[PDB]
Structure formats: C-alpha cells, structure tokens
Write a protein that binds this DNA or RNA. Sequence first.
RNA 1: GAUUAAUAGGGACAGUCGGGGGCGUCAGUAUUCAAUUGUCAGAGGUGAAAUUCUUGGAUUUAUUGAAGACUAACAACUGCGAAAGCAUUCGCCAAGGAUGUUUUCAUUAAUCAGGAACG
Lengths: 187, 275, 49, 115
Amino acid sequence: ESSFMTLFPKYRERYLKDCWPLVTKALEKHGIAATLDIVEGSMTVKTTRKTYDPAAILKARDLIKLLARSVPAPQALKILEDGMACDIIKIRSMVRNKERFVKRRQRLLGQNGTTLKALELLTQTYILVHGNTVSVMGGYKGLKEVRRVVEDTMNNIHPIYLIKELMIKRELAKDPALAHEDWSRYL
Amino acid sequence: TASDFERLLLGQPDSSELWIAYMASQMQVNDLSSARQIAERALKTINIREETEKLNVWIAYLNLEVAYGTDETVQEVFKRACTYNDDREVHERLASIYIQSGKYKEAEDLFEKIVKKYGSEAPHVWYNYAHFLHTKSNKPEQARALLKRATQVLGNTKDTYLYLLPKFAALEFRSPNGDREQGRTLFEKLLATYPKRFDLWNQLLDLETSASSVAKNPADPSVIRDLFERGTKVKGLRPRQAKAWFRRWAQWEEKFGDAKSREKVSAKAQEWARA
Amino acid sequence: EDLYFLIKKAVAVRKHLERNRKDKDSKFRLILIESRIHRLARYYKTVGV
Amino acid sequence: LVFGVARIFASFNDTFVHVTDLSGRETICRVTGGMKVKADRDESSPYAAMLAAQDVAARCKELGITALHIKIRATGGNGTKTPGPGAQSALRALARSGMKIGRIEDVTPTPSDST
RNA sequence: GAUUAAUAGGGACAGUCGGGGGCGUCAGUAUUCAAUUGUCAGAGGUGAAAUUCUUGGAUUUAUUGAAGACUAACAACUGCGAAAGCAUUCGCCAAGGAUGUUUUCAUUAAUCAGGAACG
C-alpha cells in the first residue's frame, strides 16, 4: 500500500460526486481502489496488490491533482495513456501588474477562444486556464512548446505571431529535404 | 560659564556646535551625567528638521560614552541612534570612532556585523573593512577574501562590481602592505573582463602615474611606458580619448624628464593620427 | 480645543516624519493636516481669536 | 529483504537512473540515455529508459538488493516540475524486471521564491 | 445680551479593521558560488544541431558554508492605500476607514484659474 491524496473544493464536490463512477471504473480497470470523502473533501487512491502496472499510481496522483484543479474528469482519465503528461504554469508572479496581468490573460484567451483552438490543434494538446494557473496536456514536445507560448504571451509577444511561428514550424518540419539546419531566417 | 552657555542656547537653540561645546565644558568639569543631560536636552530642544545638527549631537554622545562610559550604555545609545537616525550611517560613525579610539577588536566585530547587515547594497562598507585591514590590523589576504565575499554579496550591476574591484585595487595601490602588485592584479583582471572601458584604463594610468610604491612613494616608469603602449594598442579609441592619452603620456614624460621618450610620445601621436 | 488637538497631531506627525524622513505617504498626511491647520486657523482667526 | 534508493532525474531531454545507498551517499550505479541509445534527439525516450532500467536492474540484481524505494524529481527550480516518459517507462520496466517496491515517493525541489 | 443643532461640518473617546506606510527583526525555500565525498562517460541544447563542460570527473547523490532574489500551494466577481501599488513571523512608530457615544467652536461649507507633493 502506497497512498496519495489532496483536497478539492466545495464547488467541485458536486462535480466529483456525479462524476465519480467512471473515475473509479477506470481505476478498478487499473486495479487500484479510490473513494471520495465528503465531510472533508479528499480523494484517496490506494494501490492494491493486484496492480500489474506500476505507473498507474503516479498516473493516479496526476489524476487527483487535475481533479483538484478542476480539470475535466475524463481528460484527466485520458492522462492514463502513454504520451500524455500534465503541467501547470503560474503567471500571477510572472506579471507584476494586476490589470496588465488581466489584459494579458484575456489576450491569451483571444476573441472567442479561436486562438486557443488554433494552439491546441497545432500542438495536439488541451488547454485550461484556471486564472493564476494554466492547465496543459499532450505529448511532451507539445508541452515544451505550449510552455514557450504561455511565457511569450505573458512577455507580451502576440499569439498571432506565435501561431505564425508554429505553422511555419509545422510545414518546415513536415518537409524532409530541409531536415536539419537553423531555420530562423524563415521565422 | 553655564549662564553664558544658557544665554547662547537661548540665542541659537539649533547650534549643535555650541551644544557640544557646552557638554564638552561639562566633560571637562567631569559631571558626565550632566553632559548626558545636556546632549539629551539637545536632542529635545534643537529644531527638529536639522539632521546634521542632531547627528552631530549623536556622534558626540557616542564619543562621550566610548570615552568615559561603559559597554552597556554604548550599546544602548547605539540602539537609539539607529532607531532615530540612519542605521548604516551610525554604524559607520561608530566604526570610525572605534578606529580612532584604537579598540580594534570590537571595531572588527562591528565591521563584521555591518558587512552582514548593510553589505547587500553598500560598497563603501567593504571598502572601509579593506581599509582597516590594509591599515592597522595588517590582513591583506583576509581583505582579498573579503573581496571574494564582496563579489558574493553584491549584485553584478556595474557600479557594485566595477566599482568595488577598482576601489580595492586603489586601496592596494595606496597601502604598501596592500601590495600595488595586487592592485595591478585586480586592474589586469578588470581590463581583461572589460577591455572597452577607457575610463578604467585612464584610472589605471592615474594610479600608476601616481605614488604607487607606497613603501618609498614613487611611480614606476618602465611599466608606465608599457601600459601607455598597451593603451595605445587596444581597440576602440575615439580620437579625443587618443589625444587625451597621448597628452597624459607626454606630460608624464615631462614630469620624468626623459626628452627622448617625450619625443617618442610626440612621434607616436603623429603616427597614430595618421590614419 | 479642536485646533489644539489638530496642532497636537501635527507636531506628532512631524516628529515621526523626522524620525524617518523617507516616509512620503506620511509626508502627504502631514501636508494634508497642515492644509487643515491653515484653513481652520484662518476661519477661527476671522472671529477674533 | 534489503532496501535501496533509486533516484531518477527525468528531464524532458535526458534521463538519469541513479541508484544510491539507503543513506543516499554511496552511488551504487548510474546509467544515462547516452550510456543508452546516445541519440541527441532520442536521448529522452521510453525505449532508452527501458535500456537504462534493465542495465541497472541487472546490476542491482548482480549485487543482490531485490527491492528499492524510488525517489522521483524533475527540473524543480524554475522549469517544469513534472517527470518524463523516461521516468514512467523506467519504473514500469524496473518493476517488470522484477523486484518489489515498498512505498513510492516523488520529491521535487519546489521553490517558494522563483520570481 | 447666545435660534433650529444640519438627514454638510472637523474633532474627542472606546472597541475595532486593514497582504496601508516606514524602520528593524524572524523564518522559508529555490538559484548561484565554494567545499567534501560516492562518482565515472557522457552531460547539454535542440524541432534536429552546434557552442560549452567533460578521467584534475562534467551531469549526478548527499551534507554544509556564503551570497542575492522572492514569499509559491491558502490568493478571492475579496481587503487596504488617492495613485503608482500592497502578500513569511514578530516588534516599534506615527497615520487612515467604518461603527457607536449620555462629545464639543456653530459656518466653519462645495468648486477649481495661479501653484505645490507623490510616478
């Protein structure tokens, strides 16, 4: 037995109750138990002995931290795949000005989330913006790239410039003759 | 007398010099608690704004207590001097006071505690520590270890770095146990890490054409000619700075008296101006 | 008196400001209460005091 | 039942399998992705992690430890705090190479200070 | 000889409130530097690479010393300050908001040309 735990809030409680049977279903599929405490608000995941997968407990700790950060529940169950990995980028201490932080976070949001959808299509990820933090996912290369994108849009380089660079990246990566040089003349 | 003194304090209540003259007369007549009362009433009745006057009474009280008082009252008035005045300033003054009074060991402890507290942003405190060790305590190796601690404590901003290292090098050039060779060491490393700073080159030329060998007070013309040559040979000289350096070389060879080298400075100036 | 309490607070704020002169928000408090001193001193000098 | 300490430093471009003593002072064995595949792109790969993991598993079974207690970290100073594909694949390949685990513990050097 | 006491004043007092200010103090990490050992062939970067450090041992593992920096997770459709802004503990120093009072001089009020403090 080896246990991980954290604490979820009282607006996420109803989410976790009406949303729990699939979480415990996939985790019984991975042979690990989990229950929901309501009088305290902790999700407790307990590795059994029949756990044939050793990575499943670390994936379950990632599960419980995404459900504590109110990330969507079977996206968090999609973390149970191989190349998926979560990451959080705090930006409230990167931007020292209050209103400039708010304006830069909604500049990140863009008009109707079209820039968000373009970023997640271009990097094959999922983006959630939990105010001071941002929840991201995907393949590890995509994780590095979206961490780069969020630090540039907090340093006030515009996401339309970044989608320009990322589409030029995409095309110059899919053509094979240009396989290895320094392509900064194109960006 | 006390009556004339009260008359002049009625006339100029701000005048801290006549205040310390009054408590000085009372330390002559040796009622030291009365002198304490005079300096206290000074801090109360001197016009409030005058910081230099109040700190003069403060320094006088510190001198009074390190002369005739005890360790407990020197620490207590140290504390109230901090809470009423500038902390780093009163630490620097008590440092200089212990320097004059010769209590060099407790002086050293206060030097340690000020370089811990206000060593984050003050370079002059590390300068005064190195000044103490190149003076009386005779610890130049400990001083350059303090220089390592100094480039640890300070930021790598240009004032901090490029002004603590030349200040230390100048202190080596001005103190004979500080070894002008260590001064040339620091300045050689400085011109290595920044070969574009002609003001630093000029200051090296200044301290080398000045009294560098403090043990017998000359300059050294061989390495002076060498560094003038290298300064002519480094890249980046604007023609005004080049003319100024050629003038400095020419005037140094005029103080030397070597007219052959003076002619060589003029020939070097014309063959450099040909460009 | 009211003006007496105001000049009491005035000299107290002045004492703290000279205790640390780099306290500029409290310096602003000082210039505000000094403006109040000026106003009420004139308005109670008009009556005869 | 002998216990051990295998510390992993799985960044996103490199991966360090590094078993030390229970105190954590005597490095028992250390293998990287360059001792593995040594492809400067594939230097962080689940397959390279598999190779490093079977290498250290074979060596720790040659010296007879039969069990570990894994310590997990990442670039916790300023970069990302999550471990990598190297980490998950290495622990999978280790406990598939056979030894038994006690408790699992991931300790990453988090800051209270960053900027 | 001296009106209503104003559903405009200012103050006093008391309990408070404040990630408001200044000064000092107390921790907390992370980074860098240095040391000590176990090291023992790459590390490191990248989308691939390169530079670079690498048998005097890099990267690593552990323990310390020194340094600067900032106060994460609590952190808000919140709170304080006029603004810029303000997040460890504690202490000191004045100040400020609201509340209440069985508190007073009774127009003292409001607005900004000129000007002045803080960015």
